[PDB]
Write a protein that binds this DNA or RNA. Structure first.
Ligand SMILES: Nc1ncnc2c1ncn2[C@@H]1O[C@H](COP(=O)(O)OP(=O)(O)OP(O)(O)=S)[C@@H](O)[C@H]1O
Ligand SMILES: Nc1ncnc2c1ncn2[C@@H]1O[C@H](COP(=O)(O)OP(=O)(O)OP(O)(O)=S)[C@@H](O)[C@H]1O
Ligand SMILES: [Mg+2]
Ligand SMILES: [Mg+2]
Lengths: 432, 432, 86, 87
DNA sequence: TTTTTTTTTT
């Protein structure tokens, strides 16, 4: 049914718009269909417009086809006449035909490779790849996109925009009321959020608390620890969930009976996600390793996270440059860009913590210029919180959170607010 | 690798238990391998235990097939030896072989289906799958892999994590009341512990004292001196262990009789550990050099250290920054990260020392900002003790210790505590 | 009601919003996007607005063959060349 | 004496202890010996242990090698055996 | 070899 495909490519515009990128010369035939599709594709890539019948004829005249190909293309172009068909049905049939033809090409290549490899080494040909590259061509036949989004037309796509507005398909709510009220319903899907604070003042504590809350809200959470082992972060999360004090696990003040009892009482709830903690060596993992980790989790453990928390994002590799090849600014900006690209690609909320230069350690006020590792991070950041803590504030068992950078709302409404962080329990609560 | 797989299935149990389920009768061959695996699977089904060579022989005897196949399988069970290869390599190569054989079977089925399709409809078998069934089997070719430990799940790994809780895994006691009290059972294997003090305050004294304390408690210590020679470090260890003042060691007050007697007395103590001292030129020690000499000499001296000490962290050499760099911050941070990574890879407590800034030499208190030569070190350090010295405390033979940073406990609970120092004895004592 | 009221106006143009991965887009990628908007739709922009220039990737430098003042300036020159060309 | 060197690398543990870290790929020849030591290097860098004969000629030795050099490599692997003498 | 950057220290 290639003739219908070509006729609707030429005479229809919505049809051409819907499925251009999945049209390839290897999908029709070795005869007139491929030739006329080559004509169409040449005109398209040359003039950036759907050719008309006159344009196709003109391209035919100044071509290098023999008599047989000329006659076939001329007849096929003559047959091209517009007909009324269902748009969705046409799209579905195009998907079916493209899938079937890709599978046919794949299996033909498989036959060729297997048959030639069966031959003795002298009889076989080196022009054709060995059996080793069977799976890739086997998996490329199943990796056809079939969906292409060119842009968000402001006037033509206001229905979907309003559906996203009312449905809040982007916001991911917190468990703290103050965070929701300052972020207008939580953090969005493809975003990078930052906790800015000094050394040993509650960065990883805050990230573990956020991970615990997300896990409580039925979310698949992937905690990527860079400074402490898997058991340490899992112990912090255990202290947060089971309400066991962190000192108690060390001192053995909790019996295995009660620990297992509350573990069971947590595991029975259906409002509980899956948490996978994956520590990497300090400065030894990159965004490509993160993507491979996601792929392996999905394939083996059937795990696709919705929240990915990376504690101390700074100690990574940019995956584009050699490690320590550049200065701190360049490599950190590249790592942050890769992290936000991963967040937008997987539509996963990405939380992290930022180091602060010595000029703001033990200081009651923290600004965005006080960030240490780079200035390419705050530009790439969608939300930053200062987690300041002075001696007096630490005495009162609280931290001063400052909204130094907010893209979800105005950062001058509730700029200062106190948070009741419980240092022992690795969890913070709202003062209200 | 049919022979290896069959052998380690018959003999090994860890290999058998790790991957029994990912084994199909059609993975092996059309000849003797399939028959032997059929016999193994039949024996496992009849009796839920791994068979033995005699069991395979008798099962072959009571089996019935062609005499040529009988001889082939009998010869096949004549070569299955123990051959204890590595288990990780075993499972990895078995996974590779299984994936290759699954790919071969899928390819063969695809060829058969395509050949059946390219036939007149009269001469076709309806039992054969249609062309449309080809894609899904391709997924069955790609969706084959052994389950592997990807991350640390917080729920379905809680029992092992509790095992790591009740067992004080990754803990090394200190033989000192305040140290074990503040670290909640010693430092953890694969961490960074640092002493920050001014110039000539007792950093090397402290490291030697810790090395001796570990040596008493049956610990192997890899001392790496960057400033002092091996003889000097051995002398400091002697002064700490034998309670001989540094004056008496080089003034001749120590006699060979007493020295020999005390040495043999410590030799008879089976609780005594093993200590070595490797010296490197100032700024000429590398992480790769750490592993090399230990690797070959580990075979040569059967010595593996629980505690690795690197004197004067600030004057080491990086294994990633190839050329010398004037930037203190980047180089020192990279060196600290390299040290922490080496410690975690070897799973051994790493101790070091650090230099305070020029402004902290005359100060009675030391802050974390007053560190020198970098700010990446306080970020990479799991534990930091400031050895504060002042004239009044020096007169009282006491040095203040202030836990600047602690990931083992709360650094505000016992932040400041006096520790008695015997500089002549080069020893640490706890004030009661 | 407001959307349809704006659509009723004959003085209203067209707005196309396209998001690119941070670092993934390029001046040649921008040109390909313009060609795609001319092909798929009848859209030929008169105003092009980019949130930030330096995020993009140079079409001539491979990845980071040189420093910041060889890629950022190259992208700026490529974007001005795009403006002149279109 | 590359054959003796590789034989004692594979079979003698004490020899591997004092001689392997000072060994390199380009220290034997450009023929089969280089390929054999490359296989050994890959195995040791992948598992931190000396490969067995089976781990060498079965798991490896099935890489992208031409027949002329693959035959030589398998011949070299065949002629490997321990030699009793002092370390 | 020009640049841009974060940084420690006189
Ligand atoms: N194991 C622990 N037991 C008890 N309290 C702890 C423990 N670890 C940390 N704390 C407390 O939590 C505070 C912050 O700890 P962290 O979670 O490491 O915050 P941090 O800022 O990420 O630390 P770094 O190493 O600078 S990133 C410390 O100052 C202690 O008061
Ligand atoms: N051989 C020695 N004899 C007597 N006292 C010594 C000796 N070595 C060090 N000390 C004393 O021990 C204290 C500092 O010793 P060390 O630990 O060697 O110095 P440090 O902490 O390593 O600082 P550095 O490395 O010299 S900048 C001072 O009070 C010295 O007087
Ligand atoms: Mg922390
Ligand atoms: Mg000293």
């Amino acid at each position: 049914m290639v003739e219908i495909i070509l006729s609707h490519l030429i005479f229809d515009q919505a049809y051409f718009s819907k499925v251009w990128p999945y049209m390839d010369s290897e999908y029709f035939e070795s005869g007139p269909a491929k030739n006329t599709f080559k004509l169409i594709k040449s005109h398209v890539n040359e003039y950036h417009s759907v050719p008309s019948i006159n344009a196709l004829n003109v391209a035919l005249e100044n071509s290098s086809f023999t008599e047989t190909e000329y006659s076939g293309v001329k007849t096929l172009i003559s047959k091209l006449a517009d007909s009324p068909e269902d748009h969705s049905w046409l799209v579905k049939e195009t998907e079916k035909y493209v899938q079937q033809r890709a599978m046919f090409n794949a299996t033909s290549k498989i036959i060729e490779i297997q048959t030639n490899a069966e031959l003795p080494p002298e009889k076989r040909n080196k022009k054709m790849p060995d059996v080793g590259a069977i799976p890739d061509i086997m998996r490329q036949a199943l990796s056809i996109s079939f969906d292409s989004y060119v842009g968000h037309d402001w006037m033509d796509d206001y229905e979907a925009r309003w559906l996203s507005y009312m449905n809040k398909a982007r916001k991911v709510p917190f468990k703290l009321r103050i965070l929701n009220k300052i972020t207008k319903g939580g953090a969005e899907t493809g975003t990078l959020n930052v906790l800015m604070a000094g050394v040993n003042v509650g960065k990883s504590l805050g990230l573990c608390s956020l991970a615990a809350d997300y896990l409580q809200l039925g979310h698949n959470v992937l905690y990527i620890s860079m400074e402490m082992a898997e058991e340490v972060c899992a112990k912090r999360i255990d202290a947060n969930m089971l309400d066991v004090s962190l000192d108690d696990i060390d001192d053995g003040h909790i019996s295995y009976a009660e620990y297992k009892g509350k573990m069971e009482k947590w595991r029975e709830k259906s409002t509980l996600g899956r948490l996978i903690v994956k520590q990497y060596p300090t400065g030894g993992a990159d965004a490509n390793t993160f993507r491979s980790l996601l792929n392996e989790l999905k394939l083996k453990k059937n795990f696709v996270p919705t929240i990915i928390i990376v504690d101390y994002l700074g100690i990574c590799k940019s995956c584009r440059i050699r490690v320590y090849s550049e200065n701190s600014y360049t490599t950190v900006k590249a790592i942050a860009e890769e992290l936000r690209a991963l967040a937008v690609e997987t539509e996963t909320v990405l939380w992290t913590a930022a180091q602060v230069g010595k000029q703001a350690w033990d200081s009651s006020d923290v600004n965005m210029s006080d960030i240490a590792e780079s200035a390419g991070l705050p530009a790439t950041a969608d939300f930053m919180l200062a987690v300041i803590e002075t001696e007096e504030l630490a005495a009162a068992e609280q931290q001063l959170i400052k909204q130094i950078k907010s893209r979800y709302g105005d950062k001058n409404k509730w700029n200062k607010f106190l948070m009741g962080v419980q240092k022992g329990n690795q969890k913070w609560v709202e003062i209200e």
